[PDB]
PDB file of C-alpha atoms and ligand atoms in Angstrom:
ATOM      1  CA  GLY M   1      17.187   1.343   2.919  1.00 38.68           C
ATOM      2  CA  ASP M   2      15.961   4.986   2.610  1.00 37.71           C
ATOM      3  CA  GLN M   3      14.363   5.143  -0.877  1.00 40.65           C
ATOM      4  CA  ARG M   4      14.234   8.702  -2.118  1.00 43.71           C
ATOM      5  CA  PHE M   5      11.367   9.648  -4.201  1.00 42.12           C
ATOM      6  CA  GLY M   6      11.351  13.262  -5.054  1.00 43.37           C
ATOM      7  CA  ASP M   7      11.861  15.217  -1.821  1.00 45.85           C
ATOM      8  CA  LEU M   8      10.231  12.380   0.272  1.00 45.49           C
ATOM      9  CA  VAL M   9      11.811   9.150   1.712  1.00 46.90           C
ATOM     10  CA  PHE M  10      10.255   5.720   1.982  1.00 47.01           C
ATOM     11  CA  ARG M  11      11.555   2.762   4.141  1.00 45.71           C
ATOM     12  CA  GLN M  12      10.181  -0.614   4.350  1.00 45.63           C
ATOM     13  CA  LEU M  13       9.804  -1.663   8.111  1.00 49.32           C
ATOM     14  CA  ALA M  14       8.048  -5.089   7.602  1.00 48.08           C
ATOM     15  CA  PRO M  15       6.603  -7.159   4.749  1.00 47.26           C
ATOM     16  CA  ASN M  16       3.436  -4.975   4.470  1.00 44.44           C
ATOM     17  CA  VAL M  17       4.480  -1.701   6.207  1.00 41.69           C
ATOM     18  CA  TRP M  18       6.375   1.223   5.310  1.00 42.74           C
ATOM     19  CA  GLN M  19       7.351   4.442   6.788  1.00 39.43           C
ATOM     20  CA  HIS M  20       6.881   7.720   4.754  1.00 39.22           C
ATOM     21  CA  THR M  21       9.089  10.845   5.602  1.00 37.44           C
ATOM     22  CA  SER M  22       8.647  14.356   4.381  1.00 37.61           C
ATOM     23  CA  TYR M  23      10.437  17.533   5.265  1.00 36.87           C
ATOM     24  CA  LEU M  24       9.423  21.114   5.892  1.00 36.58           C
ATOM     25  CA  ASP M  25      11.960  23.982   6.411  1.00 36.66           C
ATOM     26  CA  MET M  26      10.466  25.412   9.544  1.00 34.30           C
ATOM     27  CA  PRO M  27      12.167  28.661  10.412  1.00 35.06           C
ATOM     28  CA  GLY M  28      14.155  28.473  13.564  1.00 36.17           C
ATOM     29  CA  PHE M  29      13.902  24.592  13.545  1.00 35.39           C
ATOM     30  CA  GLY M  30      15.706  23.630  10.371  1.00 36.83           C
ATOM     31  CA  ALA M  31      14.387  21.107   7.909  1.00 36.59           C
ATOM     32  CA  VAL M  32      12.119  18.910  10.110  1.00 37.56           C
ATOM     33  CA  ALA M  33      11.395  15.298   9.235  1.00 40.73           C
ATOM     34  CA  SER M  34       7.765  14.007   9.790  1.00 39.42           C
ATOM     35  CA  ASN M  35       7.135  10.312   9.577  1.00 37.33           C
ATOM     36  CA  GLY M  36       3.803   8.308   8.975  1.00 37.51           C
ATOM     37  CA  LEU M  37       2.988   4.817   7.909  1.00 40.55           C
ATOM     38  CA  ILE M  38       1.719   2.942   4.804  1.00 40.06           C
ATOM     39  CA  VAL M  39       0.161  -0.476   5.410  1.00 42.95           C
ATOM     40  CA  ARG M  40      -0.992  -2.868   2.836  1.00 39.57           C
ATOM     41  CA  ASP M  41      -3.926  -5.038   4.100  1.00 40.24           C
ATOM     42  CA  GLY M  42      -4.790  -7.680   1.430  1.00 40.31           C
ATOM     43  CA  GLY M  43      -5.975  -5.660  -1.572  1.00 39.03           C
ATOM     44  CA  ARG M  44      -6.081  -2.437  -0.073  1.00 38.09           C
ATOM     45  CA  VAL M  45      -3.649   0.106   1.342  1.00 40.73           C
ATOM     46  CA  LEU M  46      -4.097   2.171   4.728  1.00 41.47           C
ATOM     47  CA  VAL M  47      -2.154   5.440   5.508  1.00 43.30           C
ATOM     48  CA  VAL M  48      -1.392   6.831   8.796  1.00 39.52           C
ATOM     49  CA  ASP M  49      -0.673  10.636   8.717  1.00 38.48           C
ATOM     50  CA  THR M  50      -0.362  13.016   5.776  1.00 37.98           C
ATOM     51  CA  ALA M  51       2.843  14.666   4.771  1.00 39.86           C
ATOM     52  CA  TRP M  52       3.359  18.343   5.741  1.00 38.09           C
ATOM     53  CA  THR M  53       1.762  19.664   2.535  1.00 35.93           C
ATOM     54  CA  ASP M  54      -0.735  18.686  -0.115  1.00 32.04           C
ATOM     55  CA  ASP M  55       1.898  18.377  -2.872  1.00 31.41           C
ATOM     56  CA  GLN M  56       3.926  16.113  -0.742  1.00 32.58           C
ATOM     57  CA  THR M  57       0.732  14.075   0.252  1.00 34.04           C
ATOM     58  CA  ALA M  58      -0.060  13.615  -3.450  1.00 35.13           C
ATOM     59  CA  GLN M  59       3.509  12.303  -3.942  1.00 31.82           C
ATOM     60  CA  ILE M  60       2.899   9.744  -1.174  1.00 31.16           C
ATOM     61  CA  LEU M  61      -0.067   8.594  -3.296  1.00 30.29           C
ATOM     62  CA  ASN M  62       1.999   8.453  -6.378  1.00 30.27           C
ATOM     63  CA  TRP M  63       4.611   6.372  -4.543  1.00 30.44           C
ATOM     64  CA  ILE M  64       1.852   3.951  -3.483  1.00 27.59           C
ATOM     65  CA  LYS M  65       0.724   3.641  -7.055  1.00 28.56           C
ATOM     66  CA  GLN M  66       4.246   2.928  -8.284  1.00 26.95           C
ATOM     67  CA  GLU M  67       5.226   0.654  -5.602  1.00 26.81           C
ATOM     68  CA  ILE M  68       2.114  -1.242  -4.310  1.00 26.61           C
ATOM     69  CA  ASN M  69      -0.565  -0.407  -6.975  1.00 29.02           C
ATOM     70  CA  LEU M  70      -3.609  -0.886  -4.764  1.00 26.37           C
ATOM     71  CA  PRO M  71      -6.383   1.445  -3.723  1.00 28.01           C
ATOM     72  CA  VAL M  72      -5.859   3.635  -0.601  1.00 26.41           C
ATOM     73  CA  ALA M  73      -9.007   2.698   1.277  1.00 25.82           C
ATOM     74  CA  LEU M  74      -8.637   5.217   4.163  1.00 23.73           C
ATOM     75  CA  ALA M  75      -6.280   7.493   6.088  1.00 24.56           C
ATOM     76  CA  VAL M  76      -6.156   8.138   9.849  1.00 23.63           C
ATOM     77  CA  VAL M  77      -4.309  11.237  11.270  1.00 24.10           C
ATOM     78  CA  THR M  78      -2.952  11.370  14.613  1.00 23.27           C
ATOM     79  CA  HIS M  79      -3.477  15.045  15.833  1.00 24.63           C
ATOM     80  CA  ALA M  80      -4.259  18.524  14.513  1.00 22.38           C
ATOM     81  CA  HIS M  81      -0.873  19.709  13.715  1.00 24.80           C
ATOM     82  CA  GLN M  82       0.493  20.380  10.085  1.00 24.21           C
ATOM     83  CA  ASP M  83       2.931  17.473  10.157  1.00 23.08           C
ATOM     84  CA  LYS M  84      -0.029  15.053  10.623  1.00 19.59           C
ATOM     85  CA  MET M  85      -2.881  16.893   8.949  1.00 22.23           C
ATOM     86  CA  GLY M  86      -1.277  19.260   6.415  1.00 21.79           C
ATOM     87  CA  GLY M  87      -2.225  17.108   3.546  1.00 21.60           C
ATOM     88  CA  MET M  88      -5.789  16.418   4.162  1.00 21.05           C
ATOM     89  CA  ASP M  89      -7.162  18.192   0.935  1.00 20.34           C
ATOM     90  CA  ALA M  90      -4.850  15.988  -1.355  1.00 22.34           C
ATOM     91  CA  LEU M  91      -6.399  12.927   0.223  1.00 26.32           C
ATOM     92  CA  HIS M  92      -9.885  14.212  -0.419  1.00 24.78           C
ATOM     93  CA  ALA M  93      -9.135  15.110  -3.773  1.00 25.61           C
ATOM     94  CA  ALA M  94      -7.958  11.700  -4.258  1.00 29.91           C
ATOM     95  CA  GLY M  95     -11.293  10.290  -3.141  1.00 34.28           C
ATOM     96  CA  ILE M  96      -9.757   8.889   0.159  1.00 35.81           C
ATOM     97  CA  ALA M  97     -11.958   8.442   3.289  1.00 39.63           C
ATOM     98  CA  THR M  98     -10.372  10.156   6.281  1.00 36.98           C
ATOM     99  CA  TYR M  99     -10.523   9.772   9.904  1.00 33.12           C
ATOM    100  CA  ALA M 100      -9.188  11.589  13.152  1.00 31.60           C
ATOM    101  CA  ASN M 101     -10.111  11.871  16.688  1.00 33.29           C
ATOM    102  CA  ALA M 102     -13.296  13.856  17.084  1.00 33.22           C
ATOM    103  CA  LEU M 103     -11.276  16.309  19.136  1.00 34.10           C
ATOM    104  CA  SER M 104      -8.743  16.654  16.132  1.00 33.71           C
ATOM    105  CA  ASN M 105     -11.589  17.708  13.906  1.00 31.88           C
ATOM    106  CA  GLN M 106     -12.912  20.091  16.462  1.00 30.20           C
ATOM    107  CA  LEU M 107      -9.625  21.646  16.702  1.00 29.47           C
ATOM    108  CA  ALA M 108      -8.510  21.609  13.087  1.00 28.99           C
ATOM    109  CA  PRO M 109     -10.147  24.915  12.075  1.00 26.71           C
ATOM    110  CA  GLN M 110      -8.425  26.942  14.702  1.00 23.24           C
ATOM    111  CA  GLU M 111      -5.068  25.113  14.141  1.00 24.22           C
ATOM    112  CA  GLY M 112      -5.324  25.804  10.423  1.00 23.28           C
ATOM    113  CA  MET M 113      -5.870  22.387   9.296  1.00 25.00           C
ATOM    114  CA  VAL M 114      -8.811  20.813   7.086  1.00 25.79           C
ATOM    115  CA  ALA M 115     -10.751  18.399   9.268  1.00 26.01           C
ATOM    116  CA  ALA M 116     -10.898  14.654   8.459  1.00 28.23           C
ATOM    117  CA  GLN M 117     -14.384  13.398   7.123  1.00 26.76           C
ATOM    118  CA  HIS M 118     -15.039  11.064   9.958  1.00 25.48           C
ATOM    119  CA  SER M 119     -14.518  11.306  13.667  1.00 24.78           C
ATOM    120  CA  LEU M 120     -13.295   8.705  16.050  1.00 22.30           C
ATOM    121  CA  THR M 121     -14.377   8.381  19.521  1.00 22.04           C
ATOM    122  CA  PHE M 122     -12.715   6.462  22.236  1.00 24.78           C
ATOM    123  CA  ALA M 123     -13.806   4.343  25.208  1.00 24.16           C
ATOM    124  CA  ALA M 124     -12.959   5.132  28.742  1.00 23.73           C
ATOM    125  CA  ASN M 125     -10.005   2.708  28.561  1.00 23.13           C
ATOM    126  CA  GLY M 126      -8.686   4.410  25.442  1.00 26.36           C
ATOM    127  CA  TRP M 127      -9.519   2.005  22.700  1.00 28.20           C
ATOM    128  CA  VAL M 128     -11.342   3.450  19.672  1.00 27.03           C
ATOM    129  CA  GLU M 129     -15.128   2.737  19.784  1.00 25.73           C
ATOM    130  CA  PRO M 130     -15.216   0.279  16.953  1.00 26.09           C
ATOM    131  CA  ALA M 131     -18.266   1.528  15.182  1.00 23.88           C
ATOM    132  CA  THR M 132     -16.297   4.842  14.570  1.00 21.94           C
ATOM    133  CA  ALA M 133     -13.333   3.029  12.977  1.00 23.88           C
ATOM    134  CA  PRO M 134     -15.026   0.560  10.573  1.00 24.24           C
ATOM    135  CA  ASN M 135     -12.930  -1.454   8.111  1.00 26.00           C
ATOM    136  CA  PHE M 136      -9.685  -0.619   9.876  1.00 22.77           C
ATOM    137  CA  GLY M 137      -8.171  -4.014   9.337  1.00 23.32           C
ATOM    138  CA  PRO M 138      -5.120  -4.415  11.245  1.00 23.91           C
ATOM    139  CA  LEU M 139      -4.872  -0.756  12.614  1.00 21.29           C
ATOM    140  CA  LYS M 140      -5.509  -0.675  16.300  1.00 22.50           C
ATOM    141  CA  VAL M 141      -6.319   2.859  17.388  1.00 22.22           C
ATOM    142  CA  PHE M 142      -5.772   4.006  20.862  1.00 18.46           C
ATOM    143  CA  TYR M 143      -6.172   7.309  22.630  1.00 16.40           C
ATOM    144  CA  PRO M 144      -3.520   7.321  25.471  1.00 14.90           C
ATOM    145  CA  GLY M 145      -4.691  10.602  27.228  1.00 15.89           C
ATOM    146  CA  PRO M 146      -3.533  14.202  26.499  1.00 18.25           C
ATOM    147  CA  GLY M 147       0.246  14.694  25.998  1.00 16.04           C
ATOM    148  CA  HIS M 148       1.868  16.368  23.175  1.00 16.46           C
ATOM    149  CA  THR M 149      -1.581  17.673  22.549  1.00 16.51           C
ATOM    150  CA  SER M 150      -4.907  17.068  23.874  1.00 14.89           C
ATOM    151  CA  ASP M 151      -6.144  15.266  20.847  1.00 13.53           C
ATOM    152  CA  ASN M 152      -3.141  13.068  20.121  1.00 12.70           C
ATOM    153  CA  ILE M 153      -3.940   9.221  19.207  1.00 13.00           C
ATOM    154  CA  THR M 154      -1.683   6.205  18.513  1.00  9.95           C
ATOM    155  CA  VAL M 155      -1.666   3.245  16.296  1.00 11.08           C
ATOM    156  CA  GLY M 156      -0.596  -0.469  16.571  1.00 11.21           C
ATOM    157  CA  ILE M 157      -0.307  -2.643  13.479  1.00 10.93           C
ATOM    158  CA  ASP M 158      -1.694  -6.178  14.177  1.00 11.84           C
ATOM    159  CA  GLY M 159       0.453  -8.870  12.656  1.00 13.95           C
ATOM    160  CA  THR M 160       3.612  -6.851  13.300  1.00 13.30           C
ATOM    161  CA  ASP M 161       5.856  -5.718  16.315  1.00 11.22           C
ATOM    162  CA  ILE M 162       5.281  -2.133  15.283  1.00 12.14           C
ATOM    163  CA  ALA M 163       3.288   0.640  17.285  1.00 11.14           C
ATOM    164  CA  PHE M 164       3.091   4.286  16.111  1.00  9.30           C
ATOM    165  CA  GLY M 165       3.457   7.037  18.706  1.00  5.33           C
ATOM    166  CA  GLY M 166       3.209   9.915  16.335  1.00  4.61           C
ATOM    167  CA  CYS M 167       4.291  13.328  18.074  1.00  4.68           C
ATOM    168  CA  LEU M 168       3.569  11.844  21.636  1.00  3.52           C
ATOM    169  CA  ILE M 169       6.995   9.844  21.609  1.00  2.00           C
ATOM    170  CA  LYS M 170      10.493  11.073  21.130  1.00  2.00           C
ATOM    171  CA  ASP M 171      13.582   8.777  20.680  1.00  2.00           C
ATOM    172  CA  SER M 172      15.627   7.604  23.453  1.00  2.00           C
ATOM    173  CA  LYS M 173      18.323  10.154  22.946  1.00  2.00           C
ATOM    174  CA  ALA M 174      16.129  13.059  22.359  1.00  2.00           C
ATOM    175  CA  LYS M 175      17.306  16.219  23.983  1.00  2.00           C
ATOM    176  CA  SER M 176      13.730  17.439  24.654  1.00  2.00           C
ATOM    177  CA  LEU M 177      10.078  16.946  24.047  1.00  2.00           C
ATOM    178  CA  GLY M 178       9.926  19.363  21.197  1.00  2.00           C
ATOM    179  CA  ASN M 179       6.731  21.381  20.616  1.00  2.00           C
ATOM    180  CA  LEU M 180       5.035  21.757  24.009  1.00  2.00           C
ATOM    181  CA  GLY M 181       2.832  24.617  22.876  1.00  2.00           C
ATOM    182  CA  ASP M 182      -0.207  22.572  23.036  1.00  2.00           C
ATOM    183  CA  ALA M 183       0.956  19.842  25.489  1.00  2.00           C
ATOM    184  CA  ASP M 184      -0.741  18.760  28.754  1.00  2.00           C
ATOM    185  CA  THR M 185       2.117  19.201  31.129  1.00  2.00           C
ATOM    186  CA  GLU M 186       0.296  17.587  33.927  1.00  2.00           C
ATOM    187  CA  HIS M 187      -0.771  14.380  32.113  1.00  2.00           C
ATOM    188  CA  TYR M 188       1.950  13.869  29.430  1.00  2.00           C
ATOM    189  CA  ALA M 189       4.098  11.496  31.414  1.00  2.00           C
ATOM    190  CA  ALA M 190       1.054   9.201  32.230  1.00  2.00           C
ATOM    191  CA  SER M 191      -0.155   9.261  28.636  1.00  2.00           C
ATOM    192  CA  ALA M 192       3.237   8.184  27.331  1.00  2.00           C
ATOM    193  CA  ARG M 193       3.295   5.400  29.757  1.00  2.00           C
ATOM    194  CA  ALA M 194      -0.285   4.495  28.721  1.00  2.00           C
ATOM    195  CA  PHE M 195       0.729   4.242  25.069  1.00  2.00           C
ATOM    196  CA  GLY M 196       3.458   1.741  26.010  1.00  2.00           C
ATOM    197  CA  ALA M 197       0.989  -0.303  28.277  1.00  2.00           C
ATOM    198  CA  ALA M 198      -1.490  -0.464  25.235  1.00  2.00           C
ATOM    199  CA  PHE M 199       0.940  -2.071  22.950  1.00  2.00           C
ATOM    200  CA  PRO M 200       3.065  -4.127  25.330  1.00  2.00           C
ATOM    201  CA  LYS M 201       4.514  -6.444  22.698  1.00  2.00           C
ATOM    202  CA  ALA M 202       5.564  -3.800  20.221  1.00  2.00           C
ATOM    203  CA  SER M 203       9.345  -3.686  19.943  1.00  2.00           C
ATOM    204  CA  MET M 204       9.536  -1.252  17.041  1.00  2.00           C
ATOM    205  CA  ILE M 205       8.213   2.197  18.149  1.00  2.00           C
ATOM    206  CA  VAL M 206       7.636   4.510  15.131  1.00  2.00           C
ATOM    207  CA  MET M 207       7.421   8.297  15.804  1.00  2.00           C
ATOM    208  CA  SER M 208       6.971  11.480  13.980  1.00  2.00           C
ATOM    209  CA  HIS M 209      10.396  13.146  14.346  1.00  2.00           C
ATOM    210  CA  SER M 210      13.019  10.332  14.789  1.00  2.00           C
ATOM    211  CA  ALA M 211      13.808   7.074  13.214  1.00  2.00           C
ATOM    212  CA  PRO M 212      12.108   3.976  14.593  1.00  2.00           C
ATOM    213  CA  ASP M 213      13.449   3.041  18.004  1.00  2.00           C
ATOM    214  CA  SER M 214      13.192   0.515  20.779  1.00  2.00           C
ATOM    215  CA  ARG M 215      10.834   0.802  23.768  1.00  2.00           C
ATOM    216  CA  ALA M 216      13.346   2.779  25.371  1.00  2.00           C
ATOM    217  CA  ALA M 217      11.880   5.802  23.392  1.00  2.00           C
ATOM    218  CA  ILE M 218       8.695   5.388  25.416  1.00  2.00           C
ATOM    219  CA  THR M 219      10.532   5.403  29.103  1.00  2.00           C
ATOM    220  CA  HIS M 220      12.861   8.289  27.971  1.00  2.00           C
ATOM    221  CA  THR M 221       9.899  10.352  26.668  1.00  2.00           C
ATOM    222  CA  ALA M 222       7.872   9.680  29.852  1.00  2.00           C
ATOM    223  CA  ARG M 223      11.070  10.617  31.885  1.00  2.00           C
ATOM    224  CA  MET M 224      11.328  13.996  30.172  1.00  2.00           C
ATOM    225  CA  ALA M 225       7.584  14.451  30.674  1.00  2.00           C
ATOM    226  CA  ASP M 226       8.011  13.946  34.308  1.00  2.00           C
ATOM    227  CA  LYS M 227      10.042  17.174  34.365  1.00  2.00           C
ATOM    228  CA  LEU M 228       6.960  18.982  33.121  1.00  2.00           C
ATOM    229  CA  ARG M 229       4.885  18.302  36.326  1.00  2.00           C
TER     230      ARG M 229
HETATM  231  C1  EFR J   1       4.769  21.380  13.028  1.00  2.00           C
HETATM  232  C2  EFR J   1       5.272  20.434  14.240  1.00  2.00           C
HETATM  233  C3  EFR J   1       3.830  19.935  14.919  1.00  2.00           C
HETATM  234  S1  EFR J   1       4.422  18.675  16.202  1.00  2.00           S
HETATM  235  C4  EFR J   1       6.004  21.354  15.149  1.00  2.00           C
HETATM  236  O1  EFR J   1       5.458  22.168  15.759  1.00  2.00           O
HETATM  237  N1  EFR J   1       7.349  21.100  15.080  1.00  2.00           N
HETATM  238  C5  EFR J   1       8.188  22.074  15.916  1.00  2.00           C
HETATM  239  C6  EFR J   1       9.057  21.353  16.936  1.00  2.00           C
HETATM  240  C7  EFR J   1      10.037  20.316  16.046  1.00  2.00           C
HETATM  241  C8  EFR J   1      10.937  19.574  16.994  1.00  2.00           C
HETATM  242  C9  EFR J   1      11.939  18.640  16.394  1.00  2.00           C
HETATM  243  N2  EFR J   1      12.571  19.181  15.573  1.00  2.00           N
HETATM  244  O2  EFR J   1      11.811  17.354  16.522  1.00  2.00           O
HETATM  245  C10 EFR J   1       9.041  19.371  15.368  1.00  2.00           C
HETATM  246  C11 EFR J   1       8.193  20.126  14.347  1.00  2.00           C
HETATM  247 ZN1   ZN J   2       2.340  18.116  17.032  1.00  2.00          ZN
HETATM  248 ZN1   ZN J   3       5.008  16.546  15.053  1.00  2.00          ZN
END
């Protein structure tokens, strides 16, 4: 099921949904996988997260051209770390409109990232303010609260059982919560639980650093995050 395309891996998760995986040899951490999503919505393609680098992100676009052959209407990125935003310049060079949490765009320079072109804002209940996410099709964007980072956002795919937790959620057998340098230790557990409650019917939880898992990923993540309080 894992289609190798250069140094990247693509896996179909549902009829109109694929996971993209790219790797970076991070000193002290090994060759770390990061996952994002590709969604076909009718005659256009929507991307969730870049790869780690511009070159890898350009290869995502190449794979899309070969396997889907429809224009990429937009990309949404889920926080201002390199695994999610490292390839912004490649999207811009391709003419693709980009979106991130306003706070991700604010943080991007100090995090070493290029900001997305458009800023999402969120209602008090966590759902994106719809005027800031126009033409998002089946992508349902939710801010669960600060957790992995202050700016982390999540995305459900309407018409599927899939919800994407990004770097907020770890798999149900993960040994730790990973990179906590920017984490909100007080609020992480509640934010993880809020993601689960926003997508109550999602049975396939996609995450940045592990293969897709069941809903046990959400409760295991929250349990690990309980230990940070
Ligand atoms: C660049 C990313 C931004 S989340 C990062 O800081 N990582 C270090 C921790 C590592 C944990 C793991 N191997 O699952 C994931 C990659
Ligand atoms: Zn991160
Ligand atoms: Zn990450």
